[PDB]
Amino acid sequence: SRFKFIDIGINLTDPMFRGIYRGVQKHQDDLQDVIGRAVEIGVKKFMITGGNLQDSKDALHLAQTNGMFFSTVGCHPTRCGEFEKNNPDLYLKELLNLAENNKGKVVAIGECGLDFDRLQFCPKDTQLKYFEKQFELSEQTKLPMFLHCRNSHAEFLDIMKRNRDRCVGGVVHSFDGTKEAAAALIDLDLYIGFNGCSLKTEANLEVLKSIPSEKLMIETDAPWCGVKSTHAGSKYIRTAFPTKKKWESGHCLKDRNEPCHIIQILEIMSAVRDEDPLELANTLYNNTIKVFFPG
Ligand SMILES: Nc1ncnc2c1ncn2[C@H]1C[C@H](O)[C@@H](COP(=O)(O)O)O1
Ligand SMILES: Nc1ncnc2c1ncn2[C@H]1C[C@H](O)[C@@H](COP(=O)(O)O)O1
Ligand SMILES: Nc1ncnc2c1ncn2[C@H]1C[C@H](O)[C@@H](CO)O1
Ligand SMILES: Nc1ncnc2[nH]cnc12
Ligand code: NA
Ligand SMILES: [Zn+2]
Ligand SMILES: [Zn+2]
């Protein structure tokens, strides 16, 4: 109502929003209630993140259910082994066709990038090869990138510098790197995304203060990245939500982050930067429109 937000990365396809945890139905599907709470807090658009071919199809199909919903097409670093399970050239084409044939709903290439803290899911050589291959998607579709970078700044920056002309721009989401890393990404005319995972350490809060407002975007990565009392920014949260450990109607569930929690991320960022929250929220929204909704 007061604030307006675009969640640049919400996993609305995650089974937890249908009441399924570890393959077990624990409670009634409350996805519509989760969506409603976010709308009431000011979420105007939801970018449903795709993380592989099938999850990109699932994200688009859910996005087709609501005019506030949009999706991404790409392969997450942890899932890049899918390229070589079959034909990597065919897998790439299937992503391209899905993106190219659904302009309007599909607004970004991604999630893609590098995560050298999850090499148990996909080794470095495969991650490096298939992240760089997705620049074929960005160059052909003219869609901006939704990027992930964990424990991989040098390798990531090398790929981005060599391939920057093959994308129209993009955002490094869940940013958790140094001031120098942020500066190197800003020097490539990229944006920096902040969710709860961006705000866990004292150093994270200091790095945020070095980034201009017009270079930031906001997100939840729900159901992940919920802010805990052990995180450095938790003291700055101003809004709490009715929550239960065991599901009840009208309540969030403990440990399940939601899009409505994007207001907590805004409260932390505004407090850390000592910035008016409405001015910062409007700037974050406008940055997101400029990159992903330029129409
Ligand atoms: N296992 C593990 N180790 C280290 N860091 C991790 C791990 N899982 C998630 N993450 C971090 C990576 C991003 O900063 C954020 C969201 O990951 P996303 O993939 O966007 O949901 O969480
Ligand atoms: N191993 C590891 N390292 C870093 N970030 C991770 C890891 N596993 C998950 N994550 C990310 C995504 C989770 O939702 C959140 C848990 O951080 P918490 O502080 O437990 O609430 O942080
Ligand atoms: N390919 C994959 N197979 C299975 N699980 C996967 C994969 N990629 C990411 N994950 C998820 C589960 C981990 O707990 C989490 C990191 O904590 O990332
Ligand atoms: N435990 C987890 N499983 C899948 N994706 C994640 N992203 C962050 N944490 C995750
Ligand atoms: Na607080
Ligand atoms: Zn990510
Ligand atoms: Zn995520």
Author numbering: 2 to 296
From the study:
To elucidate the number of catalytic metal ions in Class I proteins, we determined a crystal structure of human TATDN1 bound to dAMP in the presence of Zn2+. Two zinc ions (ZnA2+ and ZnB2+) and four dAMP molecules were clearly visible in the electron density. Importantly, dAMP1 is oriented with its phosphate pointing into the active site and coordinated by both Zn2+ ions. ZnA2+ partially occupies two alternative positions and is coordinated by Glu112, Asp222, the dAMP phosphate, and several water molecules. ZnB2+ was refined to full occupancy and is coordinated by residues Glu112, His149, and His174, as well as by an oxygen of the dAMP1 phosphate. Thus, both metal ions are necessary to fully engage nucleic acid in the active site. These data also indicate that the (G/A)xN motif of Class I proteins supports binding of two metal ions with nucleic acid present in a catalytic orientation. Based on these data, we propose a catalytic mechanism for AP endo activity in which one metal ion (equivalent to ZnA2+ in our structure) activates a water molecule to perform a nucleophilic attack on the phosphate group of the DNA, and the second metal ion (MeB2+) stabilizes the negative charge on the phosphate as well as the developing charge in the pentacovalent phosphate transition state. While we did not observe a potential water nucleophile in our crystal structure, replacing the more solvent exposed of the two ZnA2+ positions with a water molecule would position it for catalysis without disturbing the two-metal ion geometry. A putative third metal binding site defined by His174, Ser175, Asn196, and Glu220 is unoccupied in our structure, and mutation of Glu220 or His174 in TATDN1 did not have a significant effect of either nuclease activity. We speculate that in TATDN1 MeA2+ is bound only when DNA is present since it partially occupies two positions and mediates interactions between the DNA phosphate and the protein in our structure.
